[PDB]
Amino acid sequence: RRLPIFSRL
Amino acid sequence: MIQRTPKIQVYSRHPAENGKSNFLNCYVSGFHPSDIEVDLLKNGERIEKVEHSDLSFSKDWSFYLLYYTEFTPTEKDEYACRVNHVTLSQPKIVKWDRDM
């Protein structure tokens, strides 16, 4: 089950 | 830009037995960047419908991929892997040797 969090560089 | 040239192994799934169906594998690894061209050869000629795994990479970020197809080794038939990559001045051909 994948990480649903997105964080831009 | 830092580049890393692929290590190349061509080998069978099970030990070679003449007349027995098998798989011919070409595993390429340790390479960057990811774009790469791999052919499997039967007597100098490209085998059609060769499959490959999905791009993954190692703890050091270097890429690996497996190319593979069904084959039936014989005494006289010569098999090989032909690889092209940005670090290679020409394509590299590694001959299949059933002892490796």
Binding site: - | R4, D54, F57
Partner: protein, 276 residues
Amino acid sequence: GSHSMRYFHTSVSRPGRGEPRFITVGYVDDTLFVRFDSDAASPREEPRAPWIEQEGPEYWDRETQICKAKAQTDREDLRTLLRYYNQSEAGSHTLQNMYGCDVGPDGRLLRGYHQDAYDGKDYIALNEDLSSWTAADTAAQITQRKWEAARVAEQLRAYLEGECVEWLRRYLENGKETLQRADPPKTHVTHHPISDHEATLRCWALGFYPAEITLTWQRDGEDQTQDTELVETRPAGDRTFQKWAAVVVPSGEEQRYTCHVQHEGLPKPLTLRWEP
């Protein structure tokens, strides 16, 4: 045993040839179980091991949605990295991400990971504390500052300590037939004449799972580390792996050489010799 779950992600730009291609795969130990490829005709997260096929439609929608969102995200990030490193827009570049968790046999968190690389070079990594960052250079320090401001590490830690560990555990149970079976290597030694004066002894390990293995030659009980050719562990195509180690042996010395095999499917380390 001890186990791990890892997700791997690669985006490769290709200016003039459309948007970057995004491929991502999930593993439990050395078993691939899911894949997504943005170049597939109909990109979905697809099963690649039988024990994941029982997850319902809602699993597949959610996983697929995440993959598509990270595909777009990576595209923005690849444009940012061009700015950060003062690069032209004409070249192809790579952004890789890996995250996941290690558990011990009791199922507890041993280690979390979340790390990125750009053009094959470490960029930024979540430290083992799951609370602080290692930036590789001044570009990545800009990311670190943004991620510190947004308390990103806190969110990663919660995933890594919670869902990562709980679903790995679920997968280990559902794939207990395969994931919790170690296949011992089948081992033999072969003899390959080079000249009148010497021959190669090649110790083989075949049909083993998982991939971790030690293969070593000794001479009169001394490790021959500098004179051993050790090939990289390679997949057979049937879930299992292969490996050999070879030493060049002077004629008549064969029985002075012993091959040593350690693997988790072996209750004891093996010792083998060439047998003419």
